Amino acid sequence: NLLSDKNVAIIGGGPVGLTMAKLLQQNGIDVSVYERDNDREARIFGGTLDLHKGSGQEAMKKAGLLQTYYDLALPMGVNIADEKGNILSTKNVKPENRFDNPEINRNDLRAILLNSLENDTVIWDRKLVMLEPGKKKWTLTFENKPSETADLVIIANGGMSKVRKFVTDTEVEETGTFNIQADIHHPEVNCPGFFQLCNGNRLMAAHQGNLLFANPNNNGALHFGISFKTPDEWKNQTQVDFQNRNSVVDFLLKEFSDWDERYKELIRVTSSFVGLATRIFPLGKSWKSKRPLPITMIGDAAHLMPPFAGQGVNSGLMDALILSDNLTNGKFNSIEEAIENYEQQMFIYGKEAQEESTQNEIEMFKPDFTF
């Protein structure tokens, strides 16, 4: 085998890195995941994830976890509303499509993947800060923790990874849109009007360059996001301190001044907001060839892209499926060639996904956009 008497280090225990670990481990591969989170009870902020047939779901199938995912996921319909709260479109999930892409909470998905791994596969409180290639092994340097070695390093630590340079000099870029997100607990009580507007479905609305997305039931909480072109005054992210809810409430109430009070109530009752600039890690020219030791990247570390049209985790789970199969099917003469074959495929569907996400972004933020 390519990996017999060798070990693999996966950097990052996100959904992509944990899936990569499971697919390698179940073929007898010595693999560890180093995750910066202090422990597994760390809450993951964000909306739900939906896994697609042919990609995310195919990775779960290969891992024996497809039913586990279905049992914790929820098919959800979609309502499009206007800024006055009129429901313009209602699409519920037809029973024959209930397996197409049901939504799963991110902590639930992490728990599924962790539970499927052998004990002590993930090493918590391990923030990788530097890599160094040796004669045959990488040396991994962690923050204030002892070093580790690995024959193969797989960078899976998300879109802002700083440990990419052995693979590419490409830099993450801001696309020019900005996202504010929040959770409301017990929304049926705390934002009843907007909760009733959703009516069990996800909701999307667009008006004059401001977009609102909401999921009224991410394991009982309501998750929502407000997205817009990054204001020109923010060449230093000025005016809005996201540590100060009053500053954020004031900014959003002005942007949403002509929206229905059900939306304004949502802004008014939120206890804290998270701001996030939209970024892309653009796939263009090939990555570096003839690297000193085998190394590659998967998931957002490889092809972070805007999330507004549903691109994201599924292309990362496709990475893990392809790369793990190449490392274990015994068709390749070296780890480098298995990696090369993975990267060549990923550049094709990754570039397509990026082009679509970037085009979609352009369209959804034109001042007169409607869904």
Ligand SMILES: Cc1cc2c(cc1C)N(C[C@H](O)[C@H](O)[C@H](O)COP(=O)(O)OP(=O)(O)OC[C@H]1O[C@@H](n3cnc4c(N)ncnc43)[C@H](O)[C@@H]1O)c1[nH]c(=O)[nH]c(=O)c1N2
């Ligand atoms: C607002 C918004 C909304 C959406 C989405 C994004 C955003 C910003 N996405 C995108 C999607 O969530 C994204 O593709 C995945 O989280 C990618 O998972 P990864 O495992 O690659 O990275 P992810 O960022 O999830 O995981 C990286 C892991 O590495 C760890 N880490 C970081 N640095 C480290 C270090 N130095 N050492 C060790 N560990 C380190 C982190 O703690 C984390 O656990 C999405 N996608 C989708 O498919 N459907 C959707 O609906 C959405 N919606």
Ligand SMILES: CN1CCN(CCCN2c3ccccc3Sc3ccc(Cl)cc32)CC1
């Ligand atoms: C099925 N999938 C579900 C959702 N995909 C869109 C993800 C958009 N995204 C979001 C975008 C920008 C800022 C914040 C957010 S937060 C959010 C919250 C709720 C919902 Cl439904 C969607 C989002 C697409 C397809």
